[PDB]
Structures are given as C-alpha cells and as structure tokens.
C-alpha cells in the first residue's frame, strides 16, 4: 500500500559526539527519490556529511548532454535507476541502463549523455580522503597540481 | 550492455595510471555468502561500494556503523529499516543513510528479493584525531 511508505524519513540518531557519546539529534535519514523536488540537468543534495561524504539525485531530460567535468579530489559514484545513458570516463565510453553503476576515481574526467527518450534519474555519491587532502592539498594555492 | 567495464584511469598520485574496473552491471554480479553481497568498488581507506541481495523474509541483525557513513539505494523489493530503535519502511527508488555511531538492522518485508546498492564512507582525518587505526594503516 503506497500510503505506508513515507516520502521523507525524520529520525533521532546518535551524534557520534566524542565528548558526549550519548548525545542525539533529529536528522533526515531517508528519501523516496521520485518525490524529491529538484533545481540542463536536475539535482538535489539529500545526505550531507561535510566534508567527507555527500549524496543526492540527478535527473536528465531527453536529449540532455552533461559536458565533461573533472572529478578532482572526489571519487564519484553513480547508480542508474531509470533511463538510458552513454558515459565517458577518460576517453573510454560505455552505455548503461537500470542497475548499472560506475565510478569516476579522483583525478579523472567524465561526461554523461541521455540516449533515451525517458528521463534518466541517478543516485550519486561523492567522497574524499580528508586526511590525504590535508597532507597533499586540494590543488589550490600553494599546492597547485 | 557490458557486464564489467575496465578503463585506464589516472592515479591521483601525479600522471601515473592504471587498469581498473570502473563499472558493473549489478544483475550480472556474482554474490557471496542469510544475505548475499559483492564488493564492487574500493578506494581504501575513504570509500567503498557494493551490492547486497536479501531473499524474502531475510533479516540482517543489528550491527554498529561505528566510524562509517553508510548509504543504501533500493533497486528492488520492500524493506523495514531500524536505525537507533526507530523503524521505517521503504521500497524501490528509496534511499537511506545510516549515520556514524548508530545501530541499524534491515529486514525484507516483501515477497520479492531485495537488492541494494550500498556505499560506505569515513572521515580519515577525524578518525586519526580520534585514535582509530593501527600503524599498519
């Protein structure tokens, strides 16, 4: 029954506070992606764990072309929930529909194109190594790469 | 189309490069063993991702997330999730996170097998500030 499956889930979670291991908070720990409002591609960041991890949803209308972008210090993850896409990672090209996943490792280039006439909807995560970023820099001054 | 996708990638070392599997079709991924799973992408120590399949009536008993953030994307089935003694129901195209320092369990409440794409991530700097990990890194 569709009425018993909430669109957003608020929940009280422990805070992982080193000083107070029993401290707690309310945080949104779940979303039904079809019902998420988005802001030529769509996205909404859903879960944020700054600075190490973030995740969200992207949708691409028919005939959409996402231009090549660098992953820089983040590893990208994409899970394809619906549609058809052709994706380039470092001049190697592949296409993929539902239940396919690909990663863009740090320091690489990627692009995505909608090759179907249904809109494509993706679950994305990006993550970075906070210790490594501190020791080597992010590519900004004075640590230009 | 392709089941495994290999690709030449730069290493973020600085121009060294590798051979690595950067894409999978989850239906063709072989699983391992209650529930079954396969680890797909590893970028030690900060990020991991994989696929889990629970059969009908399967229940993963409560375990702690400790210093890892876990996220789950539901490709098939219907589940009941307990995070910190609060339970909620979710189904296909739902995503949920298990924050650090909490207890969680997952139960299949449907008649289809459940399939999840999972990721777990950790804050390597914060872990170091807290004393987590030995000298063999």
């Amino acid at each position: 029954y569709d009425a018993f499956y909430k669109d957003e889930i608020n929940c009280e979670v422990l805070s992982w506070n080193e000083q107070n291991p029993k401290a707690s908070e309310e945080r949104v720990v779940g979303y039904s992606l079809p019902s998420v409002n988005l802001q030529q591609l769509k996205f909404a960041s859903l879960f944020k764990e700054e600075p190490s991890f973030a995740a969200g949803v992207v949708e691409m209308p028919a005939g959409a072309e996402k231009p090549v972008k660098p992953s820089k210090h983040n590893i990208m993850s994409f899970c394809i929930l619906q549609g058809k896409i052709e994706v380039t990672v470092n001049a190697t090209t592949f296409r993929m529909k539902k239940d396919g996943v690909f990663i863009v490792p740090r320091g690489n280039y990627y692009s995505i194109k909608n090759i179907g006439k249904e809109a494509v909807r993706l679950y994305y995560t990006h993550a970075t190594d906070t210790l490594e970023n501190k020791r080597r820099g992010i590519g900004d001054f004075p640590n230009e790469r």
Side-chain angles (χ1 to χ4, degrees), chain A:
Chain A
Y1 268 170
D2 215 55
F4 287 99
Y5 286 82
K6 285 177 212 238
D7 285 356
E8 281 185 21
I9 319 294
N10 200 244
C11 165
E12 199 195 356
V13 295
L14 294 176
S15 269
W16 205 53
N17 191 270
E18 187 193 51
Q19 175 201 33
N20 320 294
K22 300 200 180 154
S24 74
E25 59 183 76
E26 280 155 67
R27 170 181 185 177
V28 188
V29 307
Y31 296 83
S32 178
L33 301 186
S35 323
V36 173
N37 305 92
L38 309 147
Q39 310 275 32
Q40 34 261 80
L41 73 83
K42 314 232 231 153
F43 95 118
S45 86
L46 294 171
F47 307 121
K48 295 185 275 181
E49 197 68 65
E50 263 274 309
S52 95
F53 171 90
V57 50
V58 165
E59 181 187 314
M60 288 188 285
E65 319 184 325
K66 188 179 181 321
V68 66
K69 298 286 175 139
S71 74
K72 285 183 296 190
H73 52 281
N74 300 295
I75 171 153
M76 325 272 298
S77 210
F78 293 98
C79 182
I80 314 162
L81 303 194
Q82 99 166 6
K84 334 184 209 87
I85 64 177
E86 181 225 14
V87 46
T88 325
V89 179
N90 286 351
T92 290
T93 303
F94 54 119
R95 26 176 260 190
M96 258 185 185
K97 64 232 191 163
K98 164 137 197 114
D99 293 355
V101 295
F102 73 98
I103 53 162
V104 185
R106 301 173 290 173
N108 298 273
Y109 305 87
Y110 82 103
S111 75
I112 328 175
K113 244 142 179 164
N114 196 335
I115 67 173
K117 296 280 146 40
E118 44 181 342
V120 170
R121 160 192 316 293
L122 313 152
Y123 172 67
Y124 77 84
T125 73
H126 60 259
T128 179
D129 196 301
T130 58
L131 180 46
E132 197 72 10
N133 299 347
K134 203 206 164 139
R135 292 176 168 154
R136 281 161 34 164
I138 320 93
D140 324 316
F141 178 89
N143 321 134
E144 288 123 318
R145 324 172 77 92

